[model samples]
Target chain A: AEIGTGFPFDPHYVEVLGERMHYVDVGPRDGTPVLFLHGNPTSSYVWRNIIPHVAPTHRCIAPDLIGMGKSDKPDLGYFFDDHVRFMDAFIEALGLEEVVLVIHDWGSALGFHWAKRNPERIKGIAFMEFIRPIPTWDEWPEFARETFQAFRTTDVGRKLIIDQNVFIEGTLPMGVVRPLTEVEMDHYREPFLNPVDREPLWRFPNELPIAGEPANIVALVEEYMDWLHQSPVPKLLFWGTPGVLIPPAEAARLAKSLPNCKAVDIGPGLNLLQEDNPDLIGSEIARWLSTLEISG
Target chain B: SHMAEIGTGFPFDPHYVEVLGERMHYVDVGPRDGTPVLFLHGNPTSSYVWRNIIPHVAPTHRCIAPDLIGMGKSDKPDLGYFFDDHVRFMDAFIEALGLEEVVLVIHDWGSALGFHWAKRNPERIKGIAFMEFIRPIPTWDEWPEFARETFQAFRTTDVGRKLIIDQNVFIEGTLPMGVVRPLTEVEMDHYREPFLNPVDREPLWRFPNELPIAGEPANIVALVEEYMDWLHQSPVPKLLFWGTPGVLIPPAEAARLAKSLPNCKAVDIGPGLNLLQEDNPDLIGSEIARWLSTLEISG
Candidate 1:
């Protein structure tokens, strides 16, 4: 079923929090680790196309978060805190040091938070469509306002996200400018075959720190925003035209405010830049990676 | 851009007509005054399959090829997309276009549909030409073992959904396998474009399940039986193009068809599988043009 995806890497697993965490570890074993963190409802498979370009130079490691992708689904509340804990352990277990983080969506939030806390260990950060500075309800895109608002609700969220699997079936495809092939979609659908396996998907949206609610997450995002502005860690910002989370204007603001940041416009795309423009994204990352003076 | 690939050989802007309240996309080329030739395509293919062939026929005839509802650029309305549904939509498409006394060039499921329509309205059909079409499968014993096992799996509820809807076996797998030549990326992209999402792929899976086998799907089996009866008796100028080692209509079947049907001219196009157009378009197109010349239909 992974036929058309161009995902050729064999599955590698490591134990995190007493559950199996699946990941793709490719490229030079001794090369500097470039950790890829995907957001909700998507897996390490999301990085399939992008990884190949970077793998020739860097150790590209993309892990499926616990309760998502090929990772084990434990019977715990799949909260933001839960993801952060597992991610931290997964990285430590791999003994990945001085890692360059490539992150998106909620993965952006987690990556930024980890980088801030371990400023000495982090080499650089490349991100797109990430959560930062916690948007107020009004600040959220008007187009996505109602749909996301419903996703935060109890009954509506359960019905749409868990039961219907709308994030995989509907929203994920809707996010990309180009339609995803059926084979590509099947990989996304594989992890969450049943409603019970969809708990993480249902939880991620509600965890978004909107209007200062989810107070702890909001606080963490605020702290990271301060660190993001101050830290001179070499950063590459990939922003798409008319994007959902980090639109061009927001991208410009981040580029200006953040020290040592270079922003690249990846043509026309929505939230899923990797899906719509993988070739360009992959090449750009490789090009940017060359500029950094980090060593293995 | 992407449309240009589709327009490579078929360089006509798509014309749309509302059929059963849904948009039906088609290419209408050649002289308006010429005899209209309707080319109907099958599962996982659009009028794009007829692109190379259309030019050959279009010089002297009005070549029209429409993407069946929910199959190509045509509007994918919320419907079952069953055999009967396709027939109804096609019937409406022909009526809406005001086509009459038409020559039918059909393939795959298009053959079944064209035959059904032609059988019902004998006067409207000027002539018939078909290849790689749905035929009556008397039993599992008579069918090729490999094909029988493959199709039987396709008919299984979950297995069918997984292979067709999820894996896109028809377009990505079956289509490439059927063609003799390796399809270019651009060609495959065009084929892959329409049925991108799993929801869009529902119609493809429906085609295999609708195949009349072992007296099951009795309604469709009866339909095919009725059409075969009409075909044998009808003295219409029929052209049957078959290929060696083909999936649906092989050498033996083509020979049998030629002997059974009166006024039928059976031509061996060449080596191919289900998609003979992809393998031998030039030969098939020329043969079709030649057959059309024999049927002297006045505009």
Candidate 2:
């Protein structure tokens, strides 16, 4: 019996920087390049809905960021720097450029950082439920701050994120407005089921400047913020109401910052907006690209 | 982060320079030839936070206040905005300006960063003036419950980032509430404008989360221990200022820091909250002036 259907597309691997990088490559070989990147506790599987929508029109390549998905988990900190390094290598291995970068969560940070450095390689960007570093410490909601405080506390964070593995089991399902089937939940949880494979989930939250300890990542994200604003590459932001990560106001603010970026709200959803609203996110991106000019 | 080009014609004509590949937006005023008196502002405020205080010191001292990287006009890099990064930026800022034998004035995280710099560059530092800074956690019993509750949410939650990033409650809500006086529209805008965007608020959002509680931040606690001991043993002239009804660094902690320093004087700047600058910039500024006049440094 199939553990889960997994991806309908072919499973592919490329040796990038001494690590085995796994990706789902679908659609015609000569199609316009469209890359999909996912975030914490998720793999290329998150693209099941969106990729199918655009695969006929564009080549969709969704990779499992090292340690998170079906990719090699190197014995290294799953830090943003490490993730970016692997991503850059993977892109180079495939010779992916003039590509439409689609990303979420850490993917947004890494993709934006990569595109900024390799502007010529990118054709456009489409993002959902992604966040930049805090602009300023101002109006954090009371409930949210309390939750982060709990999660960041060393023991509790380790317990819930690592030992308990609630992020994949609980947080992922909690984000979507629609009910998730058991099999779907299984797919999300399967990769991280093994005890040792769950390190990335713990590290991703810790990397967030919640405790003001992760300066290296903050500096790296800011470098990309400059690029996001300056890059002439067309961009699309697909945000959901009460989003899992990208809140409504934030999506608006980010849209304003990126020169050629347009934002579309996918009605009500959570951080894993793709879980429930991938079609909306996908169709919007497809529509935006139809009108957007991706001049070099 | 691409810092919006800060207008050169602002009241301070703030300048930008790259420090460790990050853009540092700072206010560099007074004579280039004058003795440098570097001012380090802490949480939720920027170089603009020192508006009232800087003018009072600028005429005599070369007042240099760079917005801590990711705060104010400084480029908000994509890093984690941790404590060590702030110190690194300050080190690079001082080196970039060729500032030496300086009178160090610090508040909040600035205090920690300044002490870290001074302990390593003892000969380079002339004197130290500080307020509302990290002193010692020594024991969990010493941790104020009120302070713990105030920052408890920020230390862990997405709400913490939201508060810092989206709502900007730290400065927008906390600054005004913590200060004893009301801010005029213009003065408020001066403080508010630099952090108008959520992406720019990383520096402010991260500082409170780093506060040492029950020795959680063991590294910072160790640094504070080493530097506090150095402060006591060294002959560096030190002045400590405090305001009653303190928010973060209470009166007792401030007093302890004052007593521990070899050549330190503790002065109360009347009724105020955590931001003593807003409540009593005149007193704080003049006291600094009075203290500086006693030093033998050439201007």
Candidate 3:
């Protein structure tokens, strides 16, 4: 059924970068380039601000991840490598060029894989609490562990994560600084409202990067991180404290190796901090980007 | 299988109403649940003026066509058939039964009689469906030459009065002269019975004179204007089912009146003349059925 009470904002859909995604195109086309990447269970909505604040001078493009946003859900398991490949086609389809990549959470892996493949196409990368996956006191809670684990294995888990609406509603608000209002909740529920249609949500958890698992992506992340150190790409990190799955101690230890990267701890409880701490993290990213002259 | 099912009703026969003290005789078809669609005849015709229309829209729609004081089955005394007195008795009759939501249908002087009652109790109206009714808005572009000529000549001379008032329902003055077909013999008898003698002929003269004559017409005109104004306030849904062949109220009047009401729909069904319920029951019934469906519940 056509959802919502009426025709809402100008929501657009396309098969871009090779993955089918639904997005809201809000600004001029011939502006500076900023590509938004979201984390678990949320969508491009996480960057709702960054785009608005910068769109007058920048073209903002955010994709519904495979099984996320208004994007098509491919029923294969969820993994950063899989996400990266889907995004590669999506970016190409949009014909996005001279890009500034902004990533968060698991987004670090997804964004980095793309950045690694087309380093020249990327002008800069701004990230918050990205993939320095080390064990810390603020790591993902015990309750959430079962969910991600099930997402990696079971059909029911996949259904919850990808199809029967596990992707959007299942993840966000739990970590949002405030309880989501009805409309805000609806914003997160755009995709995966259909069950049989949600093979993508169902398959996402299975694709999650687990260490020493069948398609273990720990080696993959290590390889990508190695390239980052050698290449000296400009990267800014906006990390937050008192979060789940990623501990501050582990984040500190992990940050030491990215020679070209700098980190800052914004605040707490905004698990989708890129959405919550956008002002703080966003200013730093813009400052970091402005510091780098485009031609140089 | 659709079997004919008639619910057992009161079974008591009503005593036909007559009073030596009063000038009219009244026919009584009484007692049902909802308010009835009462037919009040005008000019020379009696309650029998609606004999043909009654049977078609009755039973499911309780029909009560009462003879006014000076017409039809009602006794017509020498006393004048005043519009005020007629409306007063009709009001009493309505009060006597506690009727509301009446589908007031009018024709000829009956239109004035119906409007008289409607002017008082527009709120009790659920629907107002009419055909060839009376009105004041005479648009310059569409006024019939003959109708205007008749109105003008009548106001100026005695010949008009002699032809219209003195003659009974039998003459062209009573029944619309432009009616295309001859009235059925049975129908003619029904109309003829009321104006049988000279005494019953009071309405013939009284109503023609009642047509907004100088100071007397002032109150009647005010009443019509007041009633129409009041009707606009009521949330009554109206439908104007106009007659064809001859322009009685003229099609424009019906169309204009429908537009004037707050919630009224006007439909002009054609390719046929007056007595449409008889000629095009299929069309009328189907049209009405569709209109009612708009108010149907989904359950």
Candidate 4:
């Protein structure tokens, strides 16, 4: 029931944007900071199994995005801009330098956005199920396309995501190949127990850069995609079979198009690659990090 | 490998033994020298049913709860999960553990198994405590109308397969229905984890068909009848914890058992159906602890 038993790390918090931002900072303080970022309906808890593999050599820092996990849910619009603003402040607040980014889902968008803006500070990037190569309506898979369509709807999305808490109960479980243990599920369910606490979950799907609907955010994603292709920083792409966002073909395309990017298939999984292949993800990142010309 | 705690209140790491050449999973806790109180669960439930209650008695007694073969975390061997199959495996499990002078705590079909074992090995059984179990196999007319119709449908091959195996009605539907409070998502997930696939749900379907209603499954009915006779005559210190409007052992049936059976104490656990442990675990545990205090068993 407690975080320590399953998570196996003491939570570290920093004051960012006048709110307590919760994160897991492990390994040597002097080690090169390896930032692990998660997407919606998940916290730093997702990286619990993966961090140990990388922590021995590098500083593993995973944060729960504002209005999620153990972070204070301050009243705000919880828009894409709000997240970017907070995330940028969180990095600057910590005074991190030559940071190696390990990002997933919306975290990928946030990481890539930051990396594009400050390429001088970033050492390398490792990502999975990233929101790169944003798909048009036709390019999106029918299952995901329709699901996100419904999630973007106002009335229906409110009832499903806010009232029923479908993101945590439905989407999270369906993404994993193996069934999650009760303790594992409860940890994910802990932060968003009340209906008001679920606004961030509802906002995430609506914020998806699809078919150029949200013109500003879509423009930003396009900008990051262009920069990611040109940037000469070392990159590692972890993908899985039959993944929701980045299947094998997509991974291969990204590996080819992006500069110095290596794609690795962990194993059979859905969207939550970490849950399915934490060891592979961790070890691959560690191995890839060793190749980078960065200070230990 | 470390066992991931599922938060079922079952705190101990699982212990496995080779019973009939298959791995049987069990929870063995409390003082080793203390008298062994073997807790048996029945039908779509496992040793997890006793999770909340085990801790209450573990301070004084050795509480051992085993998942029936093909249920919980035990090995699902390729064989008929019949009543006799369960009895054989359980008997071997008891023997393999070298358990002696054991106090039996049982529920649902577990009662039939425990009573059958106690009747045969009367010397080995120190005392007995039971709830929501079959004493005499009830006929269709004797069973509650809702239960009769439900069980009748459950016994039908096609319907039972769809409801129990395909849909997982017992764990997903009936388990929550039996308890007063709505089971948390985490609790329901733990119960659902074992029978995730339809093929893994064979034992759940087999349990309903083996109910032995209306003199069908004559062998099992006869076994129940034989055990009922032994139960009435044996001077075993039996404690009966029954709930109001419970599916099995309702107030009337409980009263009859308390009146008819030898040295049986009936305690009203209050407002539970088939899964009394979930509804009133604290009361059940305390009552069981108090009842055990009255019995003096030599270790």
Scored by TM-score, the top model is: 2
Residue A98 shift from truth in candidate 4, angstroms: 92
lDDT of 4 at A137: 76
* DockQ, every prediction: 0.01, 0.02, 0.00, 0.01
Pick the winner on DockQ between candidates 2 and 3.
Answer: 2
In terms of DockQ, which candidate is strongest? Answer: 2
All candidates' lDDT scores?
Answer: 0.85, 0.76, 0.58, 0.84
Q: What is the DockQ (computed on Cα atoms) for candidate 4?
A: 0.01
Sorted by DockQ, highest first, which candidate order results?
A: 2, 1, 4, 3
Candidate 3 stretches greater than 4 Å from native: A1-9, A17-20, A24-32, A73-82, A132-140, A153-170, B1-299
| Residues B1-299 of candidate 2: C-alpha lDDT, one tens digit per residue | 33222221247786998875568999888767756889998887777666667766777778888888777778775555767667767888888888767998898778888888899889888899988877666564565565555466677567777766788887777778677777666667877887777776776766776677667555567778788778889999999888877765678777776777788999898786777887777778878878887886756
Error of model 3, residue A114, in angstroms: 0.9
lDDT of 2 at A62: 94
Residue-wise lDDT of candidate 3 within A103-147, one digit each (tens)?
876667788878887788777787765664333322446657777
lDDT at B247, model 2 = 65
Model 3 TM-score relative to the real fold: 0.43
Clashing pairs in 1: none
Number of the predicted model whose lDDT against the real structure is largest = 1
